[PDB]
Symmetry: C3
Subunit: 114 residues, 3 copies
């Protein structure tokens, strides 16, 4: 699976270890070896929630299988704690981006992902 | 990949109050509270269209409801209209992609969204 | 989501004609005019895969119709080779992200593509 974190928080206020933690947490969450875990990070973004200078956190996860609307709460419940502890941002301003497209267009190495 | 708005136009071309009217008009059209929506735009990048390295724009219109031929057409004029007056970008140089979400797939506080 | 391309390769290691040769090949490969294919690039991104901080990269695109496993593979094969022999990247973990859409969901030139 692949996870990317987008936030308005400057790199200066961004600590270290979030990469490793996310890799291990996600691996045991999705049920896949850390070898298949892709982590993308990009701080200092020009985003504003509610039309104000309110801190926002965009979390996008891309994985095939083991997905559900009801399960989404439990999945995010394990992620909100991390962001609320590290960045201290409230889950209220967190939007989880996902996909449910057929695995027919989901491949790896010389192929395309969905 | 995740949702994000990018453009080759420098940040210096962005006037003050742009984020205000942008969200105001967006909320007014969508009919949804501005407190539930967020504005994200990363300028000063590199893009081209048809060989021409002229200023271009790409934007994702993720929402829930109000989808229709006429409705979508109205949003196109609203977006390109304001963009052409604030950022001075040609309507033929901006691409808008509409994305609808499930009613049970509402965001805000541990929830998945497009 | 959004069809954004990401790479760990910094602007200090990029070649020339990146928004020219690529689009030209992409257009010829698909059989569509390069004038109808937008091209944007986002470098200097920090990303890791499988725990390895090696220079990873993810590509994406959008097309209406003429898509599928066979079609996508016919395009990805060309992309992987071109990218490898251009940005000096390993083709072992090269993948794209082609996505489809609806004609009425495409806003262009103050109007819809519908
Ligand atoms: C789900 C797409 C797929 C996605 C992958 N990623 C990495 C993080 C971004 C999404 C990674 C893999 C993958 N699919 C396969 C498939 C399909 C087969 C594989 N092998 C290893 C040798 C045996 C066959 C290995 C992978 S790795």
């Amino acid at each position: 699976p692949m996870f990317i974190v987008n936030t308005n928080v400057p790199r200066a206020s961004v600590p270290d270890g979030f990469l490793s933690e996310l890799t291990q947490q996600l691996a045991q969450a999705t049920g896949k070896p850390p070898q298949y875990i892709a982590v993308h990070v990009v701080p200092d973004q020009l985003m504003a929630f509610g039309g104000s200078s309110e801190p926002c956190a965009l979390c996008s996860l891309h994985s095939i299988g083991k997905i559900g609307g009801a399960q989404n709460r439990s999945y995010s419940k394990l992620l909100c704690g991390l962001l609320a502890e590290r960045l201290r941002i409230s889950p209220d301003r967190v939007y989880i981006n996902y996909y449910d497209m057929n695995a027919a267009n989901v491949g790896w190495n010389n192929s395309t992902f969905a």
